[PDB]
Amino acid sequence: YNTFSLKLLEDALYELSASKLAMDDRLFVIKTGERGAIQFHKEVLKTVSG
Amino acid sequence: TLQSSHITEWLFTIHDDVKKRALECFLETAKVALKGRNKKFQYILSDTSTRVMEIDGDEFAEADYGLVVDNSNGTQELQQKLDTLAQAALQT
Amino acid sequence: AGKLGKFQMLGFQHWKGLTSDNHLGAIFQQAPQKATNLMVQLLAFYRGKS
Amino acid sequence: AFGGWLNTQGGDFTNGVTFINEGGSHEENPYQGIQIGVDGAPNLVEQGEVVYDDYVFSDRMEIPDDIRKEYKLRGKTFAKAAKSAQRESEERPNDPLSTKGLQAAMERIATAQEEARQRKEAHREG
Amino acid sequence: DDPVRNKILHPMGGVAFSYRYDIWYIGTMDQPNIFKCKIKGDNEYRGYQWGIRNPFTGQKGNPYMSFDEDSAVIHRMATLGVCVLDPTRTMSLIPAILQG
Amino acid sequence: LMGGNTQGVPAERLQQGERFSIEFAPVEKELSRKVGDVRFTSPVSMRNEW
Amino acid sequence: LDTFLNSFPTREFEDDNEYYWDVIGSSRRNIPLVEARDENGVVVAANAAN
Amino acid sequence: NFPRQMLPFSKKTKQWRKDCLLWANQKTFFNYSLVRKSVIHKKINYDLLNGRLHMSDLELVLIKAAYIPDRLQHYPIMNSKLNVLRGEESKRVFDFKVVVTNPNAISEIEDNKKNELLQRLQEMITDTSISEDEYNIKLEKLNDYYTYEWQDIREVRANELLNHYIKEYDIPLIFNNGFMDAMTCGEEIYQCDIVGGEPVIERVNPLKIRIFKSGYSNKVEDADMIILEDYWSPGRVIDTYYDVLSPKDIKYIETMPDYIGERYGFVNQNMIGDEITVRDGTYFFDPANLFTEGIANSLLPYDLAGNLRVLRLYWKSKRKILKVKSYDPETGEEEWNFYPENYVVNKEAGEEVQSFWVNEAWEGTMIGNEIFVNMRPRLIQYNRLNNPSRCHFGIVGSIYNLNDSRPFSLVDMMKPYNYLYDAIHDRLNKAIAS
Amino acid sequence: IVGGEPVIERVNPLKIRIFKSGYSNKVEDADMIILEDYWSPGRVIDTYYDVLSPKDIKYIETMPDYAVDQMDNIDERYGFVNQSLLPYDLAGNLRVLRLYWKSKRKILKVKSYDPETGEEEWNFYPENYVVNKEAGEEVQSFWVNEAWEGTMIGNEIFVNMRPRLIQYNRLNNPSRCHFGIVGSIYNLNDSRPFSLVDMMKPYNYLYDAIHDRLNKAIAS
Amino acid sequence: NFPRQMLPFSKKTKQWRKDCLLWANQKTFFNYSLVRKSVIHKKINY
Amino acid sequence: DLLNGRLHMSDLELVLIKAAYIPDRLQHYPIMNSKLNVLRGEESKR
Amino acid sequence: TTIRIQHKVAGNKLNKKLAMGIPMVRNLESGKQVKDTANMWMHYVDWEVE
Ligand SMILES: [Mg+2]
């Protein structure tokens, strides 16, 4: 990617785990760097401002 | 097959030696474990044996006090000599 | 790679592989020993108290 | 409990010294001491004293300079000098030379404490 | 976040490898997904190639000389690997400036 | 070039300022010969006056 | 990087030069159609009757 | 560089004891001992008795696949030779008891220590008995001991220690496994130690013990420095070191990745060449210049399976002591005593002193590479009466050699015949096939 | 101990997984030991009648008597056999997995002075012991092995996950414990064992090939 | 992963004890002992 | 060395090697051991 | 993957004490340099080979 989008990431962590994983078995811990979390924070901020 | 046991007795003779010193070493190792606040050694030792530790000589080896771990032929004759004397003392 | 104070005359140094005695002298870790019991007086018959 | 003991190799080995800690001072402890025994009957001790063969080395006194160069003591107190006489014998409780080295050194600090207690007693009554 | 190994910087501040998202564990598998492979129990080499003395092990005298120099050469060799049984249990998300 | 690369490295990735770091030293399995080396360092000092 | 690679378990391999693991799918499957034919052997087009 | 052991005890600090263990880990896997053989030579003799035939030990190799048209079937005809002699030893009688060597030799220092014992028993029966209710029956117990002598009370204790623990540990099986190790490599070694408060005894794997600094001595007790490497479980290190392992050191055990489970790892010293060949896991070398193959020679990896690695180093350092000549107060007898270096001499009473440097047995242990534990002077100093310097460790054993050589084992004199049996039984298995 | 009375069985050497042994030729020296067998439904209630819930008796009863994932996914690798993983057998037998493992218990080593005589005493207390200050009690906290156990029956039954009640305790170690499983390996010098069958198996394979050529010479 | 054993007695709850069994599930496939032969080698012997 | 199973080729013939291979060296067969080992086993039983 | 390393030193460095003009340091695995007080040279080589 170039531009991060969380609407794709929730649509891509779900389609491989839709009816194959349980409801308690969907905690998705993302491992990244210090700057990846701010790219994550500014895009959760754009969901909750929509 | 006695004279074929003569051929391999050179293995047992050094092996009976290592069984002597591995019990001479274990006896000194057990002697230090007495003076280590161990409530087991009051069960396997008597009244008078649990009092030897307080005399100021229990740190040294028992070879310096005149005691050896001896499995020889003399101590097996003596072990029988005290037994046939015991039954012959029982009768009469 | 520069200086942090004014009198940082030393620079960080580095090398690779086989180290000789010369690599141990250029990093200032070899010094001539002083035989302290060895002390000499130059032989003369001094006549200053004469 | 690391006070004058070598708790190693599954056993509890001591060198004779009883390091007495964690009770409190004679004023601060409610039971006026630790009360280690019933012998007098209230044998009272505090956070600093050490015992070797029922002899108490006091932690509230000090070391006179006369009784320091004599007897060659190292600690600033008699308890802190008997805490320095057993530093060799702490790691070696069953060494025969170290038990002889300890008991010979423990009678010196026992002698030097009776010399300093006599000098303090004689000066105050005078 | 390492700036020694990751050398491409990202235009939004900081290194570009730190903008990579990776979900290493997805669900329960009933086995290790990611584990370290190792042959016959860790097996490793500690060779030594020395002349009249060995500075490494501290040894003067050689009954069986390697060469005649005044030296000592150490050799160390090890074989090793990593395994991912199910790579569909892992999802990556990589910046494209790192070039594939 | 390792990794099975056949078409080569692009010439815009071999320019002045390209930084090279040490990954590892892979050897052949049969009849390998010695590779790799070992890297050292040394510090600096500072000063002040009255 | 070292404490990343310490959270992963270990497995002793009996030497050899390569390892295989067998992955499995599902036994249930839907099969596409090539064409249907009626009773007289001719095919069913799209613009046909029932 | 081993650190200087010619120091006062105050300069044997935390980092000095740690520097002795970092030396034994790093440098020594040397295996240069004058009277004992090499670890790959003993391991072949063990592998011949588990039925594994090394093709690099009966020819020059020119395979590694487990099939007969390029390997050689083994026919274990040396096992049944050795299983008679470990079978006879199990059926020999085992009555090892402590005896007085001269029971009719009772002296005055013996008779004083008996009277110290009977006084110290007499103080106990006054305190325990509640006003003559059992003071008469406790006195009847020790009226028997008025006839007992000091060399008998010392022996009754020394037999009661052995008679229990022989019967508990099945010590005749610890020894019977050792005699089997006596006939394959010629090394029989036993370690006696205080573990968990009690004395234990274990036989030491002769591939896992390094005996340094001995003088063509057949006795393992004569050595100065013994390093014992093994792979202990995490449960066995807490059974032994529950008492000395910091909570930080428990988190080293508790942060271990998982499990794995004789290829620990191989060292080769005096390598003539650089060309090493390995992809299955054993290292192949120059044909005649080198070993030509590597059978594990060391325990390099700090954790195999979940099992940790426990390196124990026992070493003789030097201790400064004092010999003091003091006169008896009552009569004019010069008496010699031995005091350590911190004892101050009582002058003005005639005490003449001289300082001697004397062996002291030390020990230290590292578990893995982060835990450093029990770095102290060894608390079982195997002491002798008139000798301050004569000690050893728990490790006791013997080499079965002739005249300070390396031991010509019973397997070693039957291995050339068993290699030829495999050579001729391969012509037979190809004559049957055609 | 089953049924209130002690028993002793033999462990099938194919049905035990001995973890974390230290090149020991013994079985009590293991830090973790897994016993996987298939039990009759009578034996899972002769053993666990007093701890099974009516939910879990239903699982023993209303198993199909010839398992599916949470999102209805059929586990397709249940239908393969080699030349476990199968909670109920096709003979009406339930998977019984028993995990024994040495945990870590924090304990205290407490130094007490005797009241009457001036002699120190040592005891061991668990970590919920509050120390008796103003009486000289010095305390140091150790970590110590504690044998735990647990049992799974099929896939849904989880029974007797608790510290093991037969702690094989020794008098001086608070940490020397093991499980009920005791055994020994008949090996030589920390190796894998060379059995009697293994040392005769190359000769039994040679007998079958030459009794083959004998039988094809008899036939022709 | 086998959960933490360096816990107090209070944090060894029901879900913790259930985690040790679900770790131990499907671990009977492999071999884990340095002094045992494999189950595919002893089943040939029986 | 004969009793330790070492053969020196410079004692049974003039040699005209240092590679220990039976196509140039000789294999020793230690048969003087069990002749001497009877007599040392009879010392231990007198 | 099969890897390999090698260091070569001169023979005179067996007992080569360091007269430390600047303090001799060891590289940590974390990237830091830590000041050391040891004076023999082969203590610092054998740190860096591992
Ligand atoms: Mg009793």
Side-chain angles (χ1 to χ4, degrees):
Chain A
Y1 78 102
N2 260 1
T3 286
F4 184 58
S5 87
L6 188 66
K7 202 266 290 177
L8 172 86
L9 188 65
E10 69 164 358
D11 188 48
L13 273 159
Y14 179 63
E15 291 292 327
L16 84 164
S17 88
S19 180
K20 306 171 187 65
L21 305 195
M23 301 293 181
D24 205 356
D25 209 17
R26 286 167 191 197
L27 181 61
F28 289 133
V29 172
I30 291 187
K31 277 168 61 169
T32 172
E34 281 176 346
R35 322 281 187 159
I38 311 171
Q39 193 176 60
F40 191 89
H41 151 65
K42 286 158 181 168
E43 293 260 346
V44 182
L45 192 139
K46 293 322 285 163
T47 64
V48 307
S49 47
Chain B
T1 63
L2 191 136
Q3 285 284 350
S4 180
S5 72
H6 271 164
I7 319 187
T8 47
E9 184 73 17
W10 85 277
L11 285 155
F12 297 99
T13 311
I14 323 183
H15 182 43
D16 296 356
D17 182 37
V18 185
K19 291 151 57 158
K20 176 168 107 87
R21 293 143 36 208
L23 298 176
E24 286 181 4
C25 165
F26 181 82
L27 192 59
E28 174 75 30
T29 298
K31 267 172 52 162
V32 185
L34 316 179
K35 43 178 94 185
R37 293 275 181 138
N38 197 338
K39 268 159 57 184
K40 160 168 194 179
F41 286 112
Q42 287 152 18
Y43 287 108
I44 74 169
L45 295 166
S46 50
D47 303 317
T48 183
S49 315
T50 51
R51 265 315 209 194
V52 181
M53 176 181 61
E54 281 78 32
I55 315 295
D56 55 347
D58 209 36
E59 288 82 15
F60 293 121
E62 297 295 327
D64 297 343
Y65 287 92
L67 298 174
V68 301
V69 180
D70 192 64
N71 166 50
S72 54
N73 215 26
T75 185
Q76 252 305 102
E77 188 169 2
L78 178 54
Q79 196 164 349
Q80 297 182 251
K81 271 179 185 153
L82 300 172
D83 286 332
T84 79
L85 189 69
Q87 323 277 18
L90 172 69
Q91 47 195 358
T92 76
Chain C
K3 67 175 82 170
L4 195 155
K6 190 155 306 302
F7 324 111
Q8 180 184 114
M9 314 281 159
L10 282 154
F12 285 87
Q13 298 171 195
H14 44 269
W15 68 97
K16 185 223 79 174
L18 164 63
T19 173
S20 165
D21 281 284
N22 184 226
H23 299 73
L24 298 195
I27 65 170
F28 320 106
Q29 300 284 330
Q30 300 277 269
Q33 53 191 293
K34 180 180 180 292
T36 322
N37 188 208
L38 289 193
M39 172 157 300
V40 302
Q41 177 76 42
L42 284 185
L43 182 49
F45 185 39
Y46 301 113
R47 305 164 174 97
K49 273 315 285 185
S50 84
Chain D
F2 65 85
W5 281 73
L6 195 80
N7 298 308
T8 190
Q9 274 174 237
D12 299 327
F13 303 90
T14 181
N15 55 300
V17 196
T18 307
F19 274 40
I20 297 185
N21 296 318
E22 274 303 324
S25 277
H26 289 74
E27 293 291 328
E28 196 214 329
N29 185 300
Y31 291 164
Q32 49 205 21
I34 298 196
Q35 197 265 329
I36 64 183
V38 191
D39 300 358
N43 316 71
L44 319 177
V45 288
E46 48 177 290
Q47 291 253 3
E49 319 194 300
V50 306
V51 188
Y52 183 77
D53 197 18
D54 315 330
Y55 189 79
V56 192
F57 296 108
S58 44
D59 205 273
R60 53 222 201 262
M61 291 187 29
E62 288 217 310
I63 291 297
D65 205 343
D66 169 51
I67 327 191
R68 172 178 296 269
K69 328 176 297 314
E70 173 60 9
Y71 301 111
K72 266 66 68 195
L73 312 179
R74 201 77 210 180
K76 76 105 171 184
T77 307
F78 281 103
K80 289 173 70 69
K83 283 194 199 169
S84 198
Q86 62 98 51
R87 290 182 69 252
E88 203 203 69
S89 159
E90 215 165 64
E91 304 110 3
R92 53 198 80 178
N94 312 306
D95 212 1
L97 309 190
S98 195
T99 52
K100 286 190 290 196
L102 183 73
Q103 192 197 1
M106 281 298 192
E107 300 288 44
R108 304 185 295 105
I109 305 191
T111 297
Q113 191 176 5
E114 300 305 89
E115 204 154 71
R117 175 223 40 77
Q118 205 70 285
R119 274 152 59 114
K120 178 212 191 72
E121 181 186 338
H123 211 308
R124 295 336 300 171
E125 73 198 290
Chain E
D1 290 315
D2 200 2
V4 189
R5 194 189 177 275
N6 326 306
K7 326 189 177 57
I8 305 138
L9 301 192
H10 194 90
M12 286 288 313
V15 69
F17 193 57
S18 74
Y19 292 90
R20 153 170 178 156
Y21 306 107
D22 217 333
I23 305 106
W24 294 90
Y25 290 109
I26 290 167
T28 65
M29 190 173 162
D30 306 309
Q31 49 191 328
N33 199 25
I34 295 188
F35 61 97
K36 269 127 64 185
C37 323
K38 65 214 9 179
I39 303 193
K40 208 137 184 135
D42 297 305
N43 214 317
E44 283 229 39
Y45 200 54
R46 186 88 75 178
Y48 287 106
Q49 202 186 20
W50 50 288
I52 208 158
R53 51 197 164 168
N54 204 339
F56 286 93
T57 44
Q59 188 167 352
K60 50 179 276 282
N62 209 3
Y64 193 59
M65 263 201 184
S66 291
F67 35 73
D68 44 52
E69 284 266 333
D70 197 14
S71 319
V73 196
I74 171 170
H75 300 81
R76 300 227 45 214
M77 184 163 165
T79 318
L80 71 165
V82 194
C83 200
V84 173
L85 301 181
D86 201 343
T88 318
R89 293 297 181 131
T90 70
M91 178 176 150
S92 303
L93 180 52
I94 307 168
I97 186 58
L98 298 156
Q99 208 142 321
Chain F
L1 281 171
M2 291 204 60
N5 202 354
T6 79
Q7 291 283 109
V9 58
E12 56 95 21
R13 290 290 93 193
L14 286 187
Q15 286 312 297
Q16 169 205 47
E18 189 97 8
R19 315 141 65 175
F20 278 73
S21 71
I22 293 96
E23 288 290 323
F24 59 101
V27 294
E28 53 193 1
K29 302 178 166 276
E30 80 162 286
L31 295 168
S32 54
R33 280 88 192 268
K34 53 99 172 182
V35 294
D37 269 298
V38 167
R39 276 75 69 115
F40 304 96
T41 34
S42 87
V44 298
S45 313
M46 267 164 69
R47 206 177 186 90
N48 209 306
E49 65 189 5
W50 296 81
Chain G
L1 198 151
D2 195 9
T3 69
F4 162 75
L5 296 161
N6 294 341
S7 57
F8 300 143
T10 50
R11 198 170 255 131
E12 129 138 8
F13 284 75
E14 223 191 56
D15 322 342
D16 208 19
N17 228 341
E18 244 201 0
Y19 34 118
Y20 292 92
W21 53 97
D22 276 2
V23 304
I24 179 77
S26 198
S27 202
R28 279 79 188 169
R29 201 174 67 167
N30 44 6
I31 318 291
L33 193 51
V34 193
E35 196 45 89
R37 273 97 75 91
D38 55 79
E39 196 200 349
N40 293 320
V42 285
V43 312
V44 190
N47 38 56
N50 297 20
Chain H
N1 48 84
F2 200 66
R4 274 168 55 239
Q5 297 144 305
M6 203 196 168
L7 296 176
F9 67 96
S10 67
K11 304 181 216 163
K12 293 172 171 162
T13 71
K14 190 105 199 85
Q15 199 57 46
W16 180 88
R17 299 164 180 193
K18 207 166 142 178
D19 274 8
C20 291
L21 278 181
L22 296 169
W23 174 91
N25 183 15
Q26 166 213 27
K27 301 222 181 254
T28 59
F29 317 117
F30 124 107
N31 88 302
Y32 173 10
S33 207
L34 299 173
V35 281
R36 58 197 305 270
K37 281 191 178 178
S38 41
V39 171
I40 58 160
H41 194 86
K42 312 181 200 141
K43 196 191 285 282
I44 286 168
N45 294 0
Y46 280 110
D47 282 354
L48 287 168
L49 294 193
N50 294 320
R52 184 183 165 181
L53 191 75
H54 276 135
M55 302 298 289
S56 298
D57 207 45
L58 70 157
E59 66 191 293
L60 267 174
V61 292
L62 319 177
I63 328 183
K64 297 102 198 172
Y67 293 107
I68 274 190
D70 218 346
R71 220 190 272 182
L72 183 54
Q73 177 69 51
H74 183 238
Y75 292 97
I77 62 170
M78 290 198 308
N79 296 62
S80 317
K81 297 286 188 293
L82 260 62
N83 285 330
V84 191
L85 305 184
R86 81 173 287 188
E88 292 198 345
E89 183 265 333
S90 168
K91 278 191 191 180
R92 291 191 156 201
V93 72
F94 185 88
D95 46 346
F96 269 82
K97 52 184 51 61
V98 184
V99 293
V100 191
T101 49
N102 301 310
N104 293 345
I106 305 100
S107 299
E108 291 303 336
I109 316 173
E110 286 195 19
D111 275 350
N112 286 337
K113 289 161 159 191
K114 167 202 165 184
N115 292 346
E116 278 149 288
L117 204 73
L118 265 297
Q119 261 166 343
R120 274 173 186 264
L121 289 173
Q122 193 189 0
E123 309 285 319
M124 271 169 28
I125 73 155
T126 63
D127 307 0
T128 299
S129 192
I130 308 308
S131 297
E132 287 269 57
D133 63 318
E134 65 189 279
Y135 189 88
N136 292 27
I137 196 54
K138 270 186 130 73
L139 172 73
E140 284 212 339
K141 285 171 111 203
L142 68 92
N143 268 107
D144 178 25
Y145 296 119
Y146 282 141
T147 45
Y148 268 57
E149 291 289 339
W150 183 244
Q151 62 201 8
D152 290 12
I153 305 173
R154 282 207 148 270
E155 169 188 15
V156 167
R157 184 189 64 157
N159 277 314
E160 277 161 5
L161 287 169
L162 286 179
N163 187 70
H164 178 88
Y165 275 123
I166 280 173
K167 288 206 162 155
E168 167 166 336
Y169 289 160
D170 199 308
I171 277 175
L173 188 51
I174 298 190
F175 288 150
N176 179 263
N177 302 331
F179 187 47
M180 190 54 173
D181 302 5
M183 299 189 284
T184 73
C185 51
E187 274 93 357
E188 207 194 329
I189 293 150
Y190 300 114
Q191 178 184 197
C192 17
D193 202 298
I194 281 167
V195 159
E198 327 282 354
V200 299
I201 175 179
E202 272 267 290
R203 49 158 284 276
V204 195
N205 195 351
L207 318 176
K208 288 192 201 190
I209 178 169
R210 307 150 193 185
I211 297 158
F212 297 135
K213 262 182 162 178
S214 165
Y216 289 106
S217 297
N218 293 352
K219 294 176 177 64
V220 173
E221 301 99 332
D222 304 3
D224 281 22
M225 188 177 291
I226 314 188
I227 311 178
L228 279 79
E229 288 217 61
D230 201 64
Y231 273 99
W232 288 16
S233 81
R236 204 205 149 168
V237 309
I238 306 177
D239 288 12
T240 311
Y241 301 105
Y242 70 81
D243 40 351
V244 45
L245 265 179
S246 160
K248 158 179 270 280
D249 285 321
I250 293 280
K251 284 186 280 187
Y252 172 62
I253 304 173
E254 211 261 317
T255 48
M256 204 138 283
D258 235 12
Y259 319 129
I260 68 170
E262 312 274 330
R263 282 151 187 197
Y264 330 110
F266 182 77
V267 315
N268 191 211
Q269 292 173 337
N270 314 8
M271 259 166 46
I272 314 190
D274 295 87
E275 309 144 49
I276 56 184
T277 308
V278 55
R279 93 292 194 282
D280 47 354
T282 69
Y283 285 66
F284 295 93
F285 298 142
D286 293 29
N289 313 308
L290 278 185
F291 279 167
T292 306
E293 199 197 11
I295 357 247
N297 210 272
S298 253
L299 286 107
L300 308 186
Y302 301 134
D303 61 4
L304 280 217
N307 303 328
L308 274 163
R309 202 207 57 155
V310 178
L311 181 139
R312 297 179 288 191
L313 165 67
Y314 310 97
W315 82 91
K316 270 165 199 191
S317 56
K318 296 170 194 176
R319 168 159 86 149
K320 194 200 215 162
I321 57 154
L322 300 178
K323 169 176 269 191
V324 171
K325 178 171 71 57
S326 45
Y327 312 97
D328 206 318
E330 55 187 1
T331 184
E333 270 164 334
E334 282 157 309
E335 320 187 10
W336 304 93
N337 293 287
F338 285 108
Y339 297 99
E341 47 179 307
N342 73 76
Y343 165 75
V344 59
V345 175
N346 176 36
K347 268 156 214 188
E348 321 302 325
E351 294 200 0
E352 313 186 39
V353 68
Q354 196 213 339
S355 164
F356 292 145
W357 282 94
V358 158
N359 277 343
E360 189 185 7
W362 277 55
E363 75 175 324
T365 310
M366 46 189 301
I367 304 161
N369 59 348
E370 311 208 352
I371 295 176
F372 284 84
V373 61
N374 268 344
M375 291 175 291
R376 71 164 144 82
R378 180 138 167 85
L379 88 168
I380 321 161
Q381 287 275 130
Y382 286 83
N383 275 306
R384 285 319 195 103
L385 205 147
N386 214 346
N387 216 348
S389 294
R390 198 188 166 193
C391 59
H392 61 110
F393 321 115
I395 296 97
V396 157
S398 177
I399 320 294
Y400 292 10
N401 57 344
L402 160 64
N403 204 49
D404 312 320
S405 74
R406 323 201 186 243
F408 199 45
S409 156
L410 215 77
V411 169
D412 268 8
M413 78 184 64
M414 293 201 307
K415 173 184 79 188
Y417 292 96
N418 192 24
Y419 284 166
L420 190 54
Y421 198 92
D422 307 355
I424 301 185
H425 216 302
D426 206 30
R427 305 194 155 233
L428 185 48
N429 287 15
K430 290 171 183 322
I432 291 159
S434 65
Chain I
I1 292 167
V2 287
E5 283 152 23
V7 304
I8 176 170
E9 314 216 349
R10 53 173 283 279
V11 166
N12 194 348
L14 319 169
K15 278 167 191 238
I16 179 176
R17 295 290 180 261
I18 298 171
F19 292 70
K20 266 173 160 178
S21 83
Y23 272 121
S24 193
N25 42 31
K26 309 195 175 203
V27 182
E28 333 100 344
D29 301 331
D31 289 23
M32 181 159 40
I33 282 177
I34 282 176
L35 267 71
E36 167 66 29
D37 213 338
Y38 273 79
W39 283 13
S40 169
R43 205 193 161 178
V44 311
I45 314 175
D46 281 25
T47 305
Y48 303 119
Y49 66 98
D50 42 1
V51 287
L52 279 173
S53 288
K55 166 182 306 216
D56 309 289
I57 300 286
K58 271 162 210 170
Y59 183 71
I60 298 171
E61 210 266 319
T62 70
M63 57 181 273
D65 298 327
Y66 278 155
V68 171
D69 207 70
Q70 199 272 357
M71 308 278 290
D72 291 310
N73 287 309
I74 306 176
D75 190 290
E76 309 276 8
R77 46 175 179 169
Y78 285 179
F80 300 104
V81 288
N82 189 255
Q83 175 63 258
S84 314
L85 168 79
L86 190 45
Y88 48 83
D89 201 355
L90 292 181
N93 284 20
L94 289 96
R95 266 212 294 109
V96 172
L97 188 94
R98 301 175 271 177
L99 176 70
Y100 310 103
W101 82 93
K102 279 170 206 191
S103 172
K104 291 173 193 172
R105 163 150 78 157
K106 185 186 208 154
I107 65 167
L108 308 178
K109 172 173 269 191
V110 159
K111 176 159 73 58
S112 57
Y113 305 91
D114 218 32
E116 304 291 10
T117 69
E119 268 58 42
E120 286 155 315
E121 322 174 89
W122 301 91
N123 328 290
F124 290 105
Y125 302 112
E127 78 269 27
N128 68 277
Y129 180 87
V130 305
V131 70
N132 180 28
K133 293 294 179 53
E134 313 101 23
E137 291 278 35
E138 317 201 77
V139 54
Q140 195 172 344
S141 48
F142 296 147
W143 284 99
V144 148
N145 298 334
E146 200 208 4
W148 278 59
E149 76 164 312
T151 312
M152 198 208 317
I153 297 163
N155 285 342
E156 205 47 71
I157 294 188
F158 292 91
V159 163
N160 273 355
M161 291 171 299
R162 59 144 159 76
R164 189 141 176 85
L165 85 172
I166 320 156
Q167 291 294 124
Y168 291 81
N169 272 316
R170 297 313 217 94
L171 202 150
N172 289 300
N173 281 322
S175 157
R176 196 169 180 185
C177 70
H178 65 93
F179 328 112
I181 312 110
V182 48
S184 177
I185 322 293
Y186 296 17
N187 62 336
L188 176 62
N189 205 65
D190 301 332
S191 65
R192 316 198 185 239
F194 195 42
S195 48
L196 286 175
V197 160
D198 272 24
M199 85 165 45
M200 292 190 313
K201 175 181 69 191
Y203 298 99
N204 198 10
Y205 285 161
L206 192 41
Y207 197 91
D208 303 352
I210 298 174
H211 217 292
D212 205 39
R213 310 177 145 225
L214 180 59
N215 281 22
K216 303 188 171 321
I218 282 166
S220 45
Chain J
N1 277 306
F2 207 50
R4 277 182 60 222
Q5 313 293 149
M6 202 206 180
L7 289 177
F9 75 102
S10 316
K11 309 181 48 154
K12 300 190 177 168
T13 41
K14 175 55 69 157
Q15 194 35 60
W16 181 83
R17 304 153 176 188
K18 273 203 167 72
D19 282 359
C20 305
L21 280 185
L22 287 156
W23 176 88
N25 206 342
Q26 320 282 5
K27 289 291 159 325
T28 319
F29 278 81
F30 299 103
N31 315 289
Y32 291 121
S33 201
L34 295 164
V35 288
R36 289 180 87 199
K37 287 182 175 181
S38 67
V39 69
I40 317 292
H41 178 84
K42 316 192 260 213
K43 203 176 177 188
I44 291 177
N45 280 357
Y46 283 119
Chain K
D1 273 22
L2 276 177
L3 307 182
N4 286 312
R6 297 165 173 242
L7 195 84
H8 301 140
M9 302 286 289
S10 61
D11 200 8
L12 80 163
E13 88 191 356
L14 268 185
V15 282
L16 285 144
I17 55 165
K18 290 187 181 295
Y21 301 111
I22 301 188
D24 206 346
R25 212 177 274 182
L26 282 194
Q27 179 62 44
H28 176 244
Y29 296 94
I31 61 173
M32 291 190 320
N33 290 36
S34 68
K35 295 268 168 291
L36 266 74
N37 281 336
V38 186
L39 303 184
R40 81 171 287 188
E42 296 198 334
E43 200 271 333
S44 86
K45 290 176 195 185
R46 298 197 175 209
Chain L
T1 76
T2 84
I3 61 162
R4 200 166 173 187
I5 210 170
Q6 166 260 352
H7 187 254
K8 174 166 200 182
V9 75
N12 72 311
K13 313 295 203 304
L14 201 150
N15 260 266
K16 176 75 63 169
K17 78 176 295 292
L18 295 171
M20 316 143 272
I22 50 167
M24 183 43 104
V25 302
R26 299 171 309 161
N27 315 10
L28 283 176
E29 68 272 12
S30 182
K32 200 192 296 179
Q33 276 177 30
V34 58
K35 186 197 290 183
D36 196 8
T37 186
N39 66 330
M40 290 298 161
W41 170 239
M42 211 48 61
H43 158 83
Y44 296 94
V45 176
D46 302 338
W47 169 259
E48 304 277 327
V49 185
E50 322 301 326

